[PDB]
Every structure is written in structure tokens, then in C-alpha cells.
Design an enzyme around this catalytic site. Sequence first.
Site, PDB file in Angstrom:
ATOM      1  CG  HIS A   1      22.040 -83.486  67.732  1.00  0.00           C
ATOM      2  ND1 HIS A   1      21.274 -83.769  68.811  1.00  0.00           N
ATOM      3  CD2 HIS A   1      22.212 -84.853  67.316  1.00  0.00           C
ATOM      4  CE1 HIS A   1      21.270 -84.881  69.268  1.00  0.00           C
ATOM      5  NE2 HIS A   1      21.802 -85.760  68.256  1.00  0.00           N
ATOM      6  CE1 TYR A   2      17.138 -86.117  71.269  1.00  0.00           C
ATOM      7  CE2 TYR A   2      18.461 -87.093  69.469  1.00  0.00           C
ATOM      8  CZ  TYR A   2      18.068 -87.059  70.709  1.00  0.00           C
ATOM      9  OH  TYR A   2      18.629 -88.142  71.485  1.00  0.00           O
ATOM     10  NE  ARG A   3      21.129 -86.274  72.091  1.00  0.00           N
ATOM     11  CZ  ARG A   3      22.111 -87.126  71.938  1.00  0.00           C
ATOM     12  NH1 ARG A   3      23.075 -86.545  71.810  1.00  0.00           N
ATOM     13  NH2 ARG A   3      21.771 -88.477  71.896  1.00  0.00           N
TER      14      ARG A   3
END
Lengths: 177, 178
Positions: A124-126
Site C-alpha cells: 500500500h502507498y501509506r
Amino acid sequence: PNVLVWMDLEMTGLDPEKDRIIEMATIITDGDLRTIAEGPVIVIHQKQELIDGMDEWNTRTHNKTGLVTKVKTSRVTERQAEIETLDFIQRHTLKNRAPLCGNSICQDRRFLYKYMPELSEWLHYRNVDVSSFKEVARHWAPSILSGFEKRASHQALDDIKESIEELRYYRNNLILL
Amino acid sequence: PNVLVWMDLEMTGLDPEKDRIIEMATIITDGDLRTIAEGPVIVIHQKQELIDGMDEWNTRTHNKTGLVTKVKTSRVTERQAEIETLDFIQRHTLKNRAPLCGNSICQDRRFLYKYMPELSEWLHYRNVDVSSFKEVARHWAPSILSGFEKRASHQALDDIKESIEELRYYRNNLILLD
Ligand SMILES: [Mn+2]
Ligand SMILES: [Mn+2]
């Protein structure tokens, strides 16, 4: 479901256009930091010419830990290390549901995005920057920090554990249910 | 002493080897998030050729906010925007004592380190990632998140305020003080 992946990366330097990854390791915990599984510790081989070009600092510390000799004798390529690491992640996570965690968040994700694109798109990008909680605790709850001592760490997996333990302490002392 | 700088950056894209900065703004608060001063809002001029090469996404949103026309008529270079921003920061901070804060921490600091080296060396190396608190609150205190609504933001300074307000809420609802 919403598990977290933790990674430790060692590189020949800081500039991703010139430097490369030489060691990586992965640990997967859940939302409340109980570890689900520990991942492989891969030493990636780089050309002997690239190692001779490192500065004082990266040459002093990587020769002091024995990583340089591991890289010399390693047969593992970057694409191969990515598959074995991604095979471990894909077994315990779903795609685009797991963020990165650690203390070298921006530094690790630069090399991850460039040199391992298939791994970086599965994550995920986070992120969860443990270092952002220590800087916040300096201003808002400095009384907490005396009760934590980062312990000595020599392997890659022990480096990851000490970051998870640092976030445990912020969880149990700095935050609210 | 103990102050924090907050920045909002708009770029022509994500790849720093190809893309550039076109808008920046700065706000400085203290340790407890009361704002000390608001900084300049600079629109940096880039060549008209570079703007024509942006993808759908960056062309749709930057034309929708009017930044593209601001860049066209701007006379400010990157080195000039750095000096005016650094002159504002140097007045309220000491060197290597102020970290970056916001929601685009890694994304902003890539372009800052490459295109504004003198500003990046005056800032402290650490960051305060507001986004890292929202992802933590998803697992440890999800009951908190319903009580915050990010509001509409159109200017660069209002974007920075909405990030500071997001950290206020985590401060007053998620953390434990004194
Ligand atoms: Mn290590
Ligand atoms: Mn903006």
C-alpha cells in the site's frame, strides 16, 4: 486484512541513481504489533567495482558488520531477491492493504520504488513512520521517552524488532484507545 | 527553539529527474501547533514545453486550479523562490532545529533535496508525517476518526492549515500529554 510489513534495507549509499541495495529483510505483524511471521534475510550481490566506490562511512560500517564479504560471495540478483521477498509477503497480506513501517521510511521507499517495482506496487502507498512519533513525543510527552532504551542490534531482523518494540512503547504509553 | 515548518508543494509530476516544482508555501508553528507566522506563496515559472508534457492527471488538476496560467505569467526562478522562502524560515527558526511536517513528507522532501539544497540543509533531517498518525489510528483508536472531517481547501496556505488541523485533532484526541 490490515497487517503491516516491516523492512530493513542496507545500501551502498544514499543516491539511488548511483547506489544499490545489498541487504533486505522483512517481518509482518498485525495491527496491534504481534508478529505474524518473520521473512527471509537476503544479501544481494553487486559488482565488486561498485563496492570499491563507497565513501568512508558506508565502507567503514559495512566492513564492520561483514556485509561486504557476504555480498562478494552472494549469487542472488536483485530480481531474485524481490521474488523471494514478495512470495513471503503475498502469503500473509492482500494486495494494496499493507503499509511500510520502520525508521528509514523515505530512505527505504526510494530504493524500493526504483529497484523493485513489483514489490512496491503490491504494498500500500501509506507508511507508518516510527521516527515521526519520537519527534512528536519530544514536544508533547517528553516524560515518556526516558522509559525506553533502544538495545544493541547486529542482524537485520534484530534491527526490525527494535523498531517494532519502539512502536510498542509509543502504543502502550503515548496513545489512547 | 522548538518550532516546526510546514510546506505545501505542487509539481509537474512525481519523477524528480523529469518533473519540477511550480508552487510552494510555508507556515511555521511551534511545538503545540499554534501558528507563529505564515510564509510566502510562490509560483515558480517553468518552460512552456515542460507543462505540455504532463500526463492527464497533472494537466487536469493544475488547469482546474489555475496554477498553469500562474506559471505561464510568473517571472520567479527556482533559486529566487528558495531565497524568499529561506529568508522567511531563517527569521523564525534556528538552523537544523526544525523538521518538516505535512502529508506529502517523502514526496516533498525528494524535490526539496534535489532542487533546493540550501533550504534542505537549513531544515532538520527529521519529519512529522501526519499521515502516519491516521494509519496508526485506523488500528488502535478507530473511534476517534469519525470526529474529524477534512474541509475543502483551494489555496496553498489552506492546504497547510488543513494538515495542521488534522494534527491538532490527533494531539487533543489520540495522544497523552504533560
Ligand atoms: Mn541492518
Ligand atoms: Mn496544494
